Design a protein around this ligand. Structure first.
Ligand SMILES: Cc1cc2nc3c(=O)[nH]c(=O)nc-3n(C[C@H](O)[C@H](O)[C@H](O)COP(=O)(O)OP(=O)(O)OC[C@H]3O[C@@H](n4cnc5c(N)ncnc54)[C@H](O)[C@@H]3O)c2cc1C
Ligand SMILES: Cn1c(-c2nc(C3CCC3)cn2CCOc2ccc(OC3CCNCC3)cc2)cc2sccc21
Ligand SMILES: Cn1c(-c2nc(C3CCC3)cn2CCOc2ccc(OC3CCNCC3)cc2)cc2sccc21
Lengths: 133, 666
């Protein structure tokens, strides 16, 4: 019902090798050239990637900044309020980004800022100009 | 198998069922109730048991009925009908046995038997046992035919047969109890030595043997599961199938490689996109860090816009550094996935030159068995006789297989050095024309009621014919002769003065250099008491080595043996014999094979006798006059001695039923 395990004998392959006299050698050559063609495309990308791997030499180590470990605070200084308006004008509704810019305001405190100071800081007009970009 | 059921197995009969041959002679029993069939089946098995328990004396009907028990021994005409059937068809009282009832004083009918091989000798013994005048005509100066034994000094080696392929169900087991045969088992161990002269490691010997046996099953799958049996209106041969299977395996080796390196370009190209993304991110990071620096240079105090600029750049720079880190994480995954694929490559090749050579040795081993190159064997039917293989180890005739036909020829009218030239059969009898092989002008005429032709298939194939038939054989017979294959394999006997090989090893092999020469001296056999090595020439080399002198053949043998055992350990042979069966005008080959486009049904066609046309137009249907026996005439046991032995008993039963009558059919 099935061939010996390891052998591959399909009705499709038997016909493609018995089609003519040298149909066997012909099939075995198109696979040889396909192997050579794939093999040299490897060393081509293997060489393209080897050059890119040297541009990334050093990583981004001369560009990292130390970690600001500051405790989360509750009250809003007038400075932190003005930081929030500029961050809204630049980042919109990215609460995580605005939280990181202010520094000591959690993500939920930033969301509450959108509602409490909604009228006084014209957060509606500021958001509609971030959307104009 | 043991008991009365073992006697049936030993006689190649089912113990619990009536055969087709038995149904023809006992149609009242097989069509009757089940209880009667079991009685008949017991009487047959019990009679076979008595004969096989002591095959050196004739088993008479009186002795059979005496050792039967009730209720089986009550019906006497049944016991008589069974005993006469078994005796007539060579199932009991065949071979060489002491006779209790002396032969009839006067003979009935005249039969001329062409050829005194085992098939002809067995038939002559039976026909004479039944009380007929039998005369054999042998072209050679000896009996045995293709059972040929070279004897010189203490050296005895068979160019003929010399192997019994198991005793379980073999009629030769009965003959071996009648004739002093020295049967010795063959040890299956066989080391391989490459052309350089060193042995093949057990790693390769087994890995190539398994692949060989795997390739064979693949052809059987091609034949019985894909119907791959015709190609361009021509029948497919076993050689063609093996070539197709191997190429498909070499094709699959390349398909596996292409799909493996394709997994590398796909992975390596994801790395290319990733590195291009990282090199652009490191660019934005380098520019952003510069802007954050310039924004920090603005020394305090500053308005909230300048403070927002530093805080903004610090966030955007930290956000890009988190992206670059997550990309370097992905780079580690893909970079190690490449060393994963580049460390586990698929097989480089299916088989190498060193492997393909050892595989050729196993193919030559198959060409030795069927005595023909695999390009001629029928893909579907080449092994059709495997289903009837005997049980037990194979044994050699250590004292020379010629002791069997010589002992059979005792007391027979054998005309040696008599070459049959013409066989004339008409509705009123036959006449065989033969000449003396020494002085061919001396002509002999033999009149007879029937002719039994056991000529080898190679002789029946000659063109122009060595034997003319008058009238010509019908087309259905001649066409069968042409379709059937008659192979060729030769033996080289080397008689030394001392043993220099491994005594506990009965055979060792020599790996040929090329596919063309793969059967040229590929196997050596130590099977005799005296220091006698025997080398085989099979396949396509069998026919070509017959055009080469014995000195050059023995020279290639000593060269092979010197590379294996030592340049100074191989002495010169004292006696050498090289067989050439294809050139033998009385054999024209070794034995038969099932050629492509043929089948086992041609074996049955070879056995059907020939009936001439009526003498007087309008006369009743004439009697069959020309009968055929021999190695090539028995479907289930061709190309063997026991097959020839059985075919002779078969025709002797049919010829006797034709000219003496069958009194057991009532
Ligand atoms: C090398 C080799 C090894 C073998 N090994 C084995 C083995 O191990 N086991 C096994 O079972 N079988 C073996 N066989 C096969 C075995 O030898 C044959 O199957 C068997 O011997 C043939 O019997 P036969 O009577 O049918 O043919 P033959 O023995 O050939 O009888 C035919 C006879 O007719 C004679 N004859 C030919 N032409 C004429 C003519 N024109 N006029 C008159 N007479 C003529 C011949 O001389 C011969 O005596 C081997 C065969 C060969 C070639
Ligand atoms: C098998 N064996 C051998 C033997 N071992 C080897 C090597 C291979 C690993 C060790 C070679 N030989 C040579 C035989 O070559 C044969 C025997 C049987 C064959 O199968 C036929 C079956 C019927 N249909 C046709 C095919 C084919 C070739 C010595 C002896 S002695 C009794 C048995 C036997
Ligand atoms: C050649 N030979 C042998 C034989 N000679 C040797 C050596 C000793 C010196 C030569 C070993 N052996 C046994 C293993 O070799 C076999 C066994 C079975 C075979 O199966 C054939 C059977 C007939 N139909 C076609 C296939 C073939 C080879 C025994 C038989 S029986 C018919 C011929 C033959």
């Amino acid at each position: 019902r099935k061939p010996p395990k390891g052998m591959f004998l399909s009705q499709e392959d038997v016909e493609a090798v018995s089609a003519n006299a040298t149909a066997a050698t012909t099939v075995l050559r198109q696979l040889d050239m396909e192997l050579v063609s794939v093999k040299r495309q490897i060393q081509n990308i293997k060489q393209t990637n080897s050059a890119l791997k040297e541009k990334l030499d050093g990583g981004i180590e001369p560009y990292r900044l130390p970690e600001v470990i500051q405790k989360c605070n509750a009250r809003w200084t007038t400075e932190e309020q003005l930081l929030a308006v500029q961050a809204i004008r630049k980042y919109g509704r990215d609460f995580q980004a605005i939280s990181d810019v202010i520094g000591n305001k959690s993500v939920v405190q930033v969301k509450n800022f959108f509602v409490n100071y909604r009228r006084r800081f014209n957060i509606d007009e500021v958001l509609q100009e971030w959307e104009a970009e | 198998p043991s008991g009365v059921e073992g006697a049936a197995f030993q006689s190649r009969l089912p113990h619990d069922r009536m055969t087709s041959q038995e149904a023809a002679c006992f149609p009242d029993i097989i069509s009757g109730p089940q209880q009667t069939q079991k009685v008949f089946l017991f009487i047959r098995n019990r009679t076979l048991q008595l004969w096989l328990d002591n095959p050196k004396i004739q088993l008479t009907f009186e002795a059979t009925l005496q050792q039967l028990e009730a209720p089986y021994n009550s019906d006497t005409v049944l016991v008589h009908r069974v005993h006469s059937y078994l005796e007539r068809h060579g199932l009991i009282n065949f071979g060489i046995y002491k006779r209790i009832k002396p032969l009839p004083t006067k003979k009935t009918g005249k039969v001329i038997i062409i050829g005194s091989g085992v098939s002809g000798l067995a038939a002559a013994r039976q026909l004479q046992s039944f009380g007929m005048d039998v005369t054999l005509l042998e072209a050679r100066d000896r009996v045995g035919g293709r059972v040929a034994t070279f004897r010189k000094g203490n050296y005895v080696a068979d160019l003929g047969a010399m192997v019994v392929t198991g005793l379980g169900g073999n009629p030769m087991a009965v003959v071996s109890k009648q004739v002093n045969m020295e049967l010795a088992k063959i040890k299956q161990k066989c080391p391989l030595y490459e052309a350089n002269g060193q042995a093949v490691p057990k790693e390769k010997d087994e890995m190539v043997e398994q692949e060989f046996n795997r390739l064979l099953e693949a052809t059987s799958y091609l034949s019985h599961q894909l119907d791959f049996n015709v190609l361009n209106n021509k029948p497919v041969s076993l050689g063609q199938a093996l070539e197709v299977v191997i190429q498909l395996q070499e094709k699959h080796v390349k398909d596996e490689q292409i799909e493996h390196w394709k997994k590398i370009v796909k992975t390596q190209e994801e790395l290319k996109e990733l590195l291009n993304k990282m090199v652009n991110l490191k660019e934005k990071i380098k520019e952003l860090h510069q802007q954050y620096k310039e924004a920090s240079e603005v020394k305090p105090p500053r308005d909230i816009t300048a403070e927002f600029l530093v805080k903004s750049k610090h966030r955007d720079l930290t956000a890009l550094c988190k992206e670059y880190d997550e990309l370097a994480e992905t780079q580690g995954k893909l970079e190690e996935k490449l060393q994963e694929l580049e460390a586990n490559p698929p097989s480089d090749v299916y088989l190498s030159s060193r492997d393909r050579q050892i595989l050729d040795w196993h193919f030559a081993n198959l060409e030795f068995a069927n005595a023909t190159p695999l390009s001629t064997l029928s893909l579907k039917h080449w092994d059709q006789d495997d289903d009837f293989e005997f049980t037990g180890s194979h044994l050699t005739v250590r004292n020379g297989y010629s002791c069997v036909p010589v002992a059979l020829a005792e007391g027979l009218d054998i005309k040696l050095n008599t070459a049959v030239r013409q066989v004339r059969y008409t509705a009123s009898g036959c006449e065989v024309i033969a000449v003396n092989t020494r002085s061919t002008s001396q002509t002999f005429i033999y009149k007879c009621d029937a002719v039994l032709c056991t000529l080898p298939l190679g002789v029946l194939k000659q063109q122009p014919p060595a034997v003319q038939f008058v009238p010509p054989l019908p087309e259905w017979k001649t066409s069968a002769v042409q379709r059937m294959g008659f192979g060729n394999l030769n033996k080289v006997v080397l008689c030394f003065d001392r043993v220099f090989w491994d005594p506990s090893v009965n055979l060792f092999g020599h790996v040929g250099s090329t596919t063309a020469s793969r059967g040229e001296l590929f196997l050596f056999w130590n099977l005799y008491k005296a220091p006698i090595l025997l080398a085989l020439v099979a396949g396509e080399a069998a026919g070509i080595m017959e055009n080469i002198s014995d000195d050059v053949i023995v020279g290639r043998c000593l060269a092979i043996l010197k590379g294996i055992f030592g340049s100074s350990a191989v002495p010169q042979p004292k006696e050498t014999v090289v067989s050439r069966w294809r050139a033998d005008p009385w054999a024209r080959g070794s034995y038969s094979y099932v050629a492509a486009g043929s089948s086992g049904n041609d074996y049955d066609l070879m056995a059907q006798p020939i009936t001439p046309g009526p003498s007087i137009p309008g006369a009743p249907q004439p009697i069959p006059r020309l009968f055929f026996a021999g190695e090539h005439t028995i479907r289930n046991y061709p190309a063997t001695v026991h097959g020839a032995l059985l075919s002779g008993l078969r025709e002797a039963g049919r010829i006797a039923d034709q000219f003496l009558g069958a009194m057991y059919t009532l």
